[PDB]
Design a binder for this molecule. Structure first.
Ligand SMILES: NC(=O)c1ccc[n+]([C@@H]2O[C@H](COP(=O)([O-])OP(=O)(O)OC[C@H]3O[C@@H](n4cnc5c(N)ncnc54)[C@H](OP(=O)(O)O)[C@@H]3O)[C@@H](O)[C@H]2O)c1
Ligand SMILES: NC(=O)c1ccc[n+]([C@@H]2O[C@H](COP(=O)([O-])OP(=O)(O)OC[C@H]3O[C@@H](n4cnc5c(N)ncnc54)[C@H](OP(=O)(O)O)[C@@H]3O)[C@@H](O)[C@H]2O)c1
Lengths: 317, 317
């Protein structure tokens, strides 16, 4: 029976992986809350890895935030993520954990990358300023993995997810991520019966979204793939695998779909006097598809179920 | 032997007309798929009308969609429908086709029209924003007909159907039309044995529904009526004829009837915290009834047969 440590099991992605691994007895979960184990503490982390018998590690712990947070607390974002990665990856190796899955991020790719973005797009150009500190910490995490794989013959894999959404997301008004922000706004506009909802921009830019449950499934899939199969579809110094749908949709389509899901009857209005971001941003998921994994949750279905979760848990935001 | 061209013969309404005209040898059908004839291409359309010997035309081709589609692709909806109408109607005239039937839509009437909506309700007030582009294209199609009738002495008739349902409807999860959306939801809720099915709104608004086969019958009836009889019951600049049942029923009654048809045993729940649309929306079918046509398919019977079709074709959605 495999003993799996899911770091950051309370977070959005961490909890999703947990929900799925809990539904099978060939795995035994070892979980620690931030109060039980502070991942920033090296000694604490090494002690934990020395005391427990861990077979696999899902590194889903991180200091995550929106546009305001990343620009307001840059030092916290680069430092905490660098330490959490270093502590876990080093401790795992020191205590013979051979399997580990590192979760990166799509905001790690160059601002002006070629679309759709293949894995080789990594380090090909300057990063988006807002995400720079966080992005550097994440890239360093991938290279730590590749470096341990090379030097010690470890099996530390990594996946790069696209924009995620689903239960346990930050539905707070402070969150800048489009899906949870719009679900919230359309929910209130519907409740207060507002004549319209104004969204900044033209609505023409194209984005990609993946439901967190699909994300968890793909993660477990990549983690459990045969080592020979994984080596065959990656390179030692370009080992990360993009995880997404490969399908993009306009912000207009997204907003209009959310309006429908929520039962909003007013008008959705795009204020084109405000600037748009990059015209298009989506991942090339060829590598993942060749590894035999395809997403199951469509946008409409995922938004409807996420809204349902939001309804049962709104007294938390 | 009459040579009839049914444009858009693969669509819901188009195929219904075809099923009925196929069941009679006094008519010979000329059909072209989108790959055989792109209706947006003027030259292609005029060439087709020049090469074939068409006696009648049923203009059932259109760019149709739900709430999300109409608000997401407004330009495609107004443009494609305007071109398809213009191309066909002009080509028909240029090549001496004297008989043509144009299929409009109920969403063409003013948002705040008087109920039941008589034909004279056309252009009496502002349109529902969601349907505005599509509605303008459709109204332009009716006026093209009236204009050719007036200037060239043509016999281009038009019918305005109410909400339609039946086989070949879009049963996809993306579809916002109430009947196919509810048949699908109740089907899955019944299969997964869900305790309840929540529907947005109070369930009190009243809507009218017509089975597509009745629609096809009425269309053929109006098309084949004697010219003197048609002129007698219409006006040159108010020539369209409403096609529907003239009977309305609440959303509550509709949902409850679908639940029964599907064999659902759970509870149907209306969430009244979500807004309703207009309280009532149905057509005045006096003109059609005076022309001697009455619908044959009742709601329960039509839903049962449509569900039956859905069951045999579910591996398409
Ligand atoms: N577009 C994208 O590429 C994208 C989008 C979403 C997520 N992701 C990936 O998923 C990762 C996780 O994101 P998420 O949305 O699941 O965030 P989240 O909900 O904040 O998860 C982070 C978890 O880590 C825990 N944690 C942080 N610092 C800790 C510490 N010092 N000791 C112990 N636990 C600590 C947090 O616990 P507390 O909150 O209890 O402190 C939290 O439960 C990201 O870093 C990213 O790589 C990528
Ligand atoms: N409530 C209402 O008032 C109501 C409700 C339903 C229908 N209707 C009326 O019925 C009309 C048809 O509706 P429907 O439900 O039958 O839609 P549908 O199933 O989408 O039928 C449209 C057909 O037109 C074809 N088509 C579209 N563009 C074409 C092109 N450029 N070249 C060749 N073929 C083209 C489509 O073929 P492909 O899909 O193969 O491209 C499709 O088979 C509507 O426009 C409306 O006037 C009214």
């Amino acid at each position: 029976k495999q003993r799996v440590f899911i770091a950051g099991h309370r977070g959005m992605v961490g909890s999703a992986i947990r929900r799925q691994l809990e539904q099978r007895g060939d795995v035994e979960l070892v979980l620690r809350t931030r109060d039980e184990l502070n991942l920033l503490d090296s000694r604490a982390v090494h002690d934990f890895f020395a005391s427990e018998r861990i077979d696999q590690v899902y590194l889903a712990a991180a200091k995550v935030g929106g546009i305001v947070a990343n620009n307001t607390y840059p030092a916290d974002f680069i430092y905490q993520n660098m330490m959490i990665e270093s502590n876990i990856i080093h401790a795992a190796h020191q205590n013979d954990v051979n399997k580990l899955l590192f979760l990166g991020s799509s905001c790690i790719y160059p601002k002006l990358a070629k679309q759709p973005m293949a894995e080789s797009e990594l380090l090909q150009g300057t990063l988006e300023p807002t995400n720079e500190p966080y992005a550097i910490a994440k890239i360093a995490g991938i290279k730590l993995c590749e470096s341990y794989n090379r030097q010690y013959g470890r099996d530390y894999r990594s996946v790069m997810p696209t924009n995620l959404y689903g239960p346990h997301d930050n539905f707070h008004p402070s969150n800048s991520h489009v899906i949870p922000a719009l679900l919230r706004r359309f929910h209130e506009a519907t409740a207060q019966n507002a004549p319209d909802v104004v969204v900044w921009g033209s609505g023409t830019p194209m984005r990609e979204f993946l439901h967190v449950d699909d994300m968890a499934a793909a993660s477990i899939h990549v983690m459990e793939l045969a080592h020979e199969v994984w080596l065959e579809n990656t390179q030692p110094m370009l080992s990360h695998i993009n995880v997404g749908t490969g399908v993009d949709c306009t912000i207009r389509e997204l907003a209009q779909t959310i309006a429908k899901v929520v039962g909003y009857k007013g008008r959705v209005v795009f204020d084109a006097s405000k600037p748009d971001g990059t015209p298009r941003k989506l991942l090339d998921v060829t590598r993942l598809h060749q590894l035999g994994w395809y997403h199951e949750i469509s946008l409409e279905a995922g938004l409807a179920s996420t809204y349902q979760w939001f309804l049962e848990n709104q007294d938390r935001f």
